[PDB]
Amino acid sequence: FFVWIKLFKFINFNRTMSQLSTTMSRCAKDLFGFAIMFFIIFLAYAQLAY
């Protein structure tokens, strides 16, 4: 599993058209910031339904 993970990491460091889709992980401060304002609404609706 560690060798597979290392190969996957090396694929991220490979040529273009595949590294472009992993640099997006720099802006994970929003995908977490959005998921916290998506569960407040989710729990509000769940409580209303309950």
Partner: peptide, 12 residues
């Protein structure tokens, strides 16, 4: 090519 690359990444 990028769509195929992304699909391959998701499969991996």
């Amino acid at each position: 090519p990028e769509l195929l690359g992304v699909t391959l990444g998701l499969v991996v």
